[PDB]
Design a protein around this ligand. Structure first.
Ligand SMILES: [Mg+2]
Ligand SMILES: [Mg+2]
Ligand SMILES: [Mg+2]
Ligand SMILES: [Mg+2]
Ligand SMILES: [Mg+2]
Ligand SMILES: [Mg+2]
Ligand SMILES: [Mg+2]
Ligand SMILES: [Mg+2]
Ligand SMILES: [Mg+2]
Ligand SMILES: [Mg+2]
Ligand SMILES: [Mg+2]
Ligand SMILES: [Mg+2]
Ligand SMILES: [Mg+2]
Ligand SMILES: [Mg+2]
Ligand SMILES: [Mg+2]
Ligand SMILES: [Mg+2]
Ligand SMILES: [Mg+2]
Ligand SMILES: [Mg+2]
Ligand SMILES: [Mg+2]
Ligand SMILES: [Mg+2]
Ligand SMILES: [Mg+2]
Ligand SMILES: [Mg+2]
Ligand SMILES: [Mg+2]
Ligand SMILES: [Mg+2]
Ligand SMILES: [Mg+2]
Ligand SMILES: [Mg+2]
Ligand SMILES: [Mg+2]
Ligand SMILES: [Mg+2]
Ligand SMILES: [Mg+2]
Ligand SMILES: [Mg+2]
Ligand SMILES: [Mg+2]
Ligand SMILES: [Mg+2]
Ligand SMILES: [Mg+2]
Ligand SMILES: [Mg+2]
Ligand SMILES: [Mg+2]
Ligand SMILES: [Mg+2]
Ligand SMILES: [Mg+2]
Ligand SMILES: [Mg+2]
Ligand SMILES: [Mg+2]
Ligand SMILES: [Mg+2]
Ligand SMILES: [Zn+2]
Lengths: 86, 122, 158, 134, 50, 59, 52, 135
RNA sequence: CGCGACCUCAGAUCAGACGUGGCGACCCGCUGAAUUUAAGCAUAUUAGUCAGCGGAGGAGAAGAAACUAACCAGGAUUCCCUCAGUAACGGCGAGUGAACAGGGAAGAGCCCAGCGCCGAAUCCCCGCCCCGCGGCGGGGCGCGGGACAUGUGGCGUACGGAA
RNA sequence: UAAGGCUAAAUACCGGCACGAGACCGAUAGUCAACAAGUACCGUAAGGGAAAGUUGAAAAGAACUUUGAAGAGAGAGUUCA
RNA sequence: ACCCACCCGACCCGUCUUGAAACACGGACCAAGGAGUCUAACACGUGCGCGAGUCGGGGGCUCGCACGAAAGCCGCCGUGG
RNA sequence: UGGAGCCGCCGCAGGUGCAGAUCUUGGUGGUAGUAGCAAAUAUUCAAACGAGAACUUUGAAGGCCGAAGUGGAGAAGGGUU
RNA sequence: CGACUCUUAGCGGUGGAUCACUCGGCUCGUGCGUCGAUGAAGAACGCAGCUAGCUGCGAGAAUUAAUGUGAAUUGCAGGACACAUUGAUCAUCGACACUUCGAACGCACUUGCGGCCCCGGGUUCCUCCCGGGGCUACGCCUGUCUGAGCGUCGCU
């Protein structure tokens, strides 16, 4: 019974989609994640899983603010001006 | 056919809106026509109209925001939008006048004992 | 296990040392960087010696070194007092001053006064403005040299 | 040699630079020589080839002394299609065979204002260098 | 389930949109290495991010 | 119609009235398993649906 | 590893000795010809020239 | 002092480390005091603290804090060093007078550990195979 | 049984500011093993090392002697070479292990409290004008508010300082 | 001369942006990853984690005829092949 | 050197073992991969340079390094080992 | 055969030579057209479509589930079935 | 000779070694050394005429403006444009814009409930009703207003 017949009654779920990290690891009863620790103000990362660390470092995502900051800096953080017009 | 930024710049505010509306109408009909086959000849326009719509909306926001920062240029407290965003930290640097405030003691030092240009061997 | 004769020797490779090996592939790149930075600093301090300020003569400590003599950190206050250079000014003419130096013997003192005297002789103080007031030297000793002094200024030779 | 320590001389880097080149940069790459005739007249070695220049193919199969008008410039494919430079496919349909711009010679340019100002800029730099050499 | 949240329903919708096979005009593009979608998910075998 | 998912029936009603100069009896939305909120819109009996349908293009 | 002993340092006189040895055999047509250099028609082997 | 937070005793390990009761924190109570004042008032920048009394159970302290962004501090040149962002969280890094003392740095023979920047840095220096080019 | 000072405390979607999370190669503060070595093992070692928590900067930390020395004396900190696998520690076993001097890279020194003198001579915020305004500043003018004598500012800090 | 404080520089840098090079590897190597890779896939979850480069100079990628329901052939053609 | 015939000879390799054709283990077959490395310290031997000396580091002076992160030189030539 | 680079000599350098590791990754055999495609009584006739029918569909017959159902509806789970 | 089996070679299969290529790695170096409540990193969901994935962007959604460039983009369509004109296409990027979660902020995570000010329909401020807009996290500092106390006084 311990095996195949008991796989039969896996009718209901522990985790769902976490709304910070996106992973299917938000434990419903605990009402925390276990991936980012969602309710926890700070993100969960541990130094033992260097592979896990790399899977959602900065680079990873869009970097939609951060990628235009790098450009902005390059040319010198100029604000509120234009190039000489035609 | 072509809507340029060029001309829109000068136009009146109410005139810009009517133009946007008239494009929004034209976009609708093409979207309708895309469903009912329509024709490749129509299904071009849909991209064109979209970008001309943007060209209009863009001009409007540029005009509204230029006028706005004219209105506050002078006033001390101004909206966060119109304040100059550089970088979180860079908006907490010392003031540009505040970081070249010498203490009177330090000023007196610079007055009495200035570094002198000198050379040696003569 | 040891085998027939040899130094019963203790190497210190029991910690994780390969985690803290420090290579020297820099060093050429470093050596240049210093050298550029050096040449830049000269060029900034235009007719001033590249060296730095003038520094005192000083004997080493201990029975061992004792006999030798180096450059010290800076001239003592007594040495400035006797030479007749106001300590706050001495910094402005390129004279190193430390104030923590005692001065035990009068042989080391008069030597170091002599140093400053000699310095003041062969120094070319430019005037503040191109219009020339007191102290500032003649335009002869100025045109003939706005020259830097290569190497340590008035070097000590034991 | 190259002495500028910010250029590359690195197969992988040059090829990557080449194949992933952006349109406006490809324009320059896809340049082609002028005929000795024009070389004399304008004081210019070569020019960025364009939609409707007149042109000879110099090398290959289509190598010939005919002067075909350019048909299009496929900057993605690093190639230009030329009037009668074509081949019949299985089912009779003609297909414009690609020729690389550099294996072609421009006999007649399509002169617009901008092409005119370009030629004026290149000729002037050439004569500055001859004045500097002299 | 027939009792869905909205969160879940939207998730399913995107998954349902992703399934479609490649458009054949893609094969005719210039530098094309793609022959088939290879991210096709059949409900009976392989069972969602859930 | 297909409608923007954020819309209330109140908004749709108001839009349908505004765009097509028309007037609505009731709106009756659902969400397609695809993502696009569909909307069935009953027009008031003074108006014919096929007539407006011809006006807007569809038939 | 990176800390393989890449560089190799040589006594200074020895370095000079080598450089003297090479100079000394930059004379000697045989050693120059054997090293491949077509020096058949050259006028004098420690070949020195005007300083224009 | 500081009892070792482990369930029951059960500091499983070699019986060097079996201790739980008679062992003592590195930083002082006064530093802990500052650190807590610092924690609470994040904007505020801990300058320095002093003592005001002690019961058996408690100690008391008085941590002087400073707004780095109040003009009277900003514009006063002699304080405007605290408005620089290196001085964020002095107390947390071991930089107030109090939390300096644990670091174990002073000039002279009675130190040597901390003969670079700090305790950690000297160890670092002393346990680097410097591996030179030519050897 | 009022009204008024202050003290200590509340509440405001009060006016204006700041802090929160991230990254983490390098850096600062804590915390802290056990494999392992000892041919067993418990001190030792592995190691103030991994993991754990905290906080930063373009670097950080350190730093202007409650220092070295014992010399005919040196003279902040950091870094390299050396000292030195040395002095020392250690079931004096395994093993561990610095500093001064010396030569270099660099080089830069300063400020308070206090003690005192000076009508608080000081600071913040309001409001009106002129300039300047995409690092909110200058100048002027207001019986316009407040902080402050339970001490702000100038002079001054051991290398002496004041009169 | 302790029990208050500030301070550039030589110093560090397996993260970032942007470059340069190599007595390195050359698709079972070199990064897990030369490719729609932290992808597919697995696991409730923490986490685990692949395989996979090459037609040709040019698509000129085989019109047309014929057998077959078709896949498949037989001729024909393209290509220096 | 391909095949076949015949006479004589001739047990299956690897390995641990006093002893293996073993009723000792590993091995269906083929391809590619696959294990005495590097650093440090010592000792002895050998080769070269200089020799009561020797030494090169570390540092510095000479270049934007194409070759150079080389090469050269240093009252630092010897602080020091 | 193939279709774009490669070798001799003198020196230097090394991730430098495979039959074995119940070795690693990939491939292929013999075993073998073998084991096997046996739980729960059952199929038959004609026609239609169709290249093609033991299996589709329609009709006819014979059978079973036998309302604690092999029927009619949900929950959870699936996620377009 | 017959079949079968074994051996060798030819040719064909299977299989993907080898060799040759390399827009990828690995290592060493140089310069700079910049994230965030003005909403970061990360996640979500969207957006193409035909587009699933990768990428690119945000309801102005394979991008708008500007400046530089100067005829394309191209799998097919369609188109534009007068490429003697701010002008295709790329590049840059200073103006504009930037859906929802997220430190994550009205309170909740259903995507549910709200409050308070103003605007349009709705009224003719009649509150309802609908739609739009702007506020409504915690902590803390400087001030401000309202206060509390058999806390310490003063005058009445
Ligand atoms: Mg003062
Ligand atoms: Mg120096
Ligand atoms: Mg299933
Ligand atoms: Mg122990
Ligand atoms: Mg103490
Ligand atoms: Mg933080
Ligand atoms: Mg042991
Ligand atoms: Mg053992
Ligand atoms: Mg044991
Ligand atoms: Mg220890
Ligand atoms: Mg750690
Ligand atoms: Mg610092
Ligand atoms: Mg001190
Ligand atoms: Mg010292
Ligand atoms: Mg020794
Ligand atoms: Mg130790
Ligand atoms: Mg005072
Ligand atoms: Mg400090
Ligand atoms: Mg491969
Ligand atoms: Mg391969
Ligand atoms: Mg690989
Ligand atoms: Mg291969
Ligand atoms: Mg192949
Ligand atoms: Mg291959
Ligand atoms: Mg061939
Ligand atoms: Mg044995
Ligand atoms: Mg036996
Ligand atoms: Mg055997
Ligand atoms: Mg037997
Ligand atoms: Mg065995
Ligand atoms: Mg076996
Ligand atoms: Mg092999
Ligand atoms: Mg020997
Ligand atoms: Mg080839
Ligand atoms: Mg190798
Ligand atoms: Mg093998
Ligand atoms: Mg059978
Ligand atoms: Mg049913
Ligand atoms: Mg055969
Ligand atoms: Mg393969
Ligand atoms: Zn999460």
């Amino acid at each position: 019974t311990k095996g195949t017949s008991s796989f039969g009654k896996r009718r209901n779920k522990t985790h769902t989609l976490c709304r910070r990290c996106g992973s299917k690891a938000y434990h419903l009863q605990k009402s925390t994640c276990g991936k980012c620790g969602y309710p926890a103000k700070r993100k969960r990362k541990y130094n033992w899983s260097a592979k896990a660390k790399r899977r959602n470092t900065t680079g990873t995502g869009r970097m939609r603010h951060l990628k235009i900051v790098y450009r902005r800096f390059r040319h010198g953080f100029r604000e509120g001006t234009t190039p000489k017009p035609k | 056919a072509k809507i340029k930024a060029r001309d829109l710049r000068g136009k009146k505010k109410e005139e810009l809106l009517k133009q946007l509306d008239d494009l929004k109408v034209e976009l609708s009909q093409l979207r309708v026509a895309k469903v009912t086959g329509g024709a490749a000849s129509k299904l071009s326009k849909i991209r064109v109209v979209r970008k001309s719509i943007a060209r209009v909306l863009t001009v409007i926001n540029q005009t509204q925001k230029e006028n706005l920062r004219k209105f506050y240029k002078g006033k001390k407290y101004k909206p966060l939008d119109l304040r100059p965003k550089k970088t979180r930290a860079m908006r907490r640097r010392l003031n540009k006048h505040e970081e070249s405030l010498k203490t009177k003691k330090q000023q007196r030092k610079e007055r009495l004992y200035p570094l002198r240009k000198y050379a040696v061997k003569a | 296990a040891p085998s027939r004769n040899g130094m019963i020797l203790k190497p210190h490779f029991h910690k994780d040392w390969q985690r803290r090996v420090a290579t020297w592939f820099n060093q050429p790149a470093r050596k240049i960087r210093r050298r550029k930075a050096r040449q830049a600093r000269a060029r900034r301090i235009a007719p001033r010696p590249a060296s730095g300020p003038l520094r005192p003569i000083v004997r080493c400590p201990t029975v061992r070194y004792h006999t030798k003599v180096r450059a010290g950190r800076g001239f003592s206050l007594e040495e400035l007092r006797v030479a007749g250079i106001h300590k706050k000014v001495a910094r402005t003419i390129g004279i190193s001053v430390d104030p923590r130096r005692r001065n035990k013997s009068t042989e080391s003192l008069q030597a170091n006064v002599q140093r400053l005297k000699e310095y003041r002789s062969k120094l070319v103080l430019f005037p503040r403005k191109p219009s020339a007031p007191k102290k500032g030297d003649s335009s002869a000793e100025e045109l003939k040299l706005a020259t830097q002094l290569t190497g340590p200024v008035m070097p000590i030779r034991n | 040699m190259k002495f500028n320590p910010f250029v590359t001389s690195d197969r992988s880097k040059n090829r990557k630079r080449h194949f992933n080149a952006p349109s406006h940069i490809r324009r320059k790459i896809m340049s082609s020589p002028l005929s000795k005739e024009l070389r004399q007249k304008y004081n210019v070695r070569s020019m960025p080839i364009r939609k409707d220049d007149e042109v000879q193919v110099v090398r290959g199969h289509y190598k010939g002394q005919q002067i075909g008008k350019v048909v299009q410039v496929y900057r993605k494919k690093y190639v230009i299609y030329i009037e009668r430079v074509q081949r019949e496919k299985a089912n009779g349909t003609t297909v414009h065979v690609g020729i690389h711009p550099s294996k072609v010679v421009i006999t007649r340019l399509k002169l617009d204002k901008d092409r005119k100002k370009i030629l004026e800029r290149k000729a002037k730099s050439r004569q500055v260098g001859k004045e500097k050499g002299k | 389930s027939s009792h869905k949240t909205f969160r879940i329903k939207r998730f399913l919708a995107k998954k349902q949109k992703q399934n479609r096979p490649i458009p054949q005009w893609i094969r005719m593009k210039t530098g094309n290495k793609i022959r088939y979608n290879s991210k096709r998910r059949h409900w009976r075998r392989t069972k969602l991010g859930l | 119609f297909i409608v923007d998912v954020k819309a209330n029936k109140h908004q749709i009603k108001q839009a349908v009235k505004k765009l097509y100069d028309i007037d609505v009896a009731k709106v009756n939305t659902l969400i397609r398993p695809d993502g696009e909120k569909k909307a069935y819109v009953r027009l008031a009996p003074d108006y014919d649906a096929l007539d407006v349908a011809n006006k807007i293009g569809i038939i | 590893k990176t800390w393989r002993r890449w560089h190799r340092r040589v006594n200074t006189t020895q370095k000079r000795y080598a450089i003297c040895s090479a100079l000394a055999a930059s004379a000697l047509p045989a050693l120059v010809m054997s090293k491949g250099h077509r020096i058949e028609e050259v006028p004098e082997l420690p070949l020195v020239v005007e300083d224009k | 002092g500081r009892k070792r937070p482990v369930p029951k005793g059960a500091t499983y390990g070699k019986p060097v480390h079996h201790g739980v009761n008679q062992l003592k924190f590195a930083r002082s109570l006064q530093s802990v005091a500052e650190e807590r004042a610092g924690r609470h008032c994040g904007a505020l920048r801990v300058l320095n603290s002093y003592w005001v009394g002690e019961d058996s159970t408690y100690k008391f302290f008085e941590v002087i804090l400073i707004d780095p962004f109040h003009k009277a501090i900003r514009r006063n040149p002699d304080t405007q060093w605290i408005t620089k962002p290196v001085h964020k969280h002095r107390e947390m890094r071991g930089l107030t007078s109090a939390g300096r003392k644990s670091r174990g740095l002073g000039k002279g023979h009675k130190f040597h550990h901390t003969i670079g920047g700090s305790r950690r840095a000297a160890w670092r220096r002393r346990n680097t195979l410097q591996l030179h080019r030519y050897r």
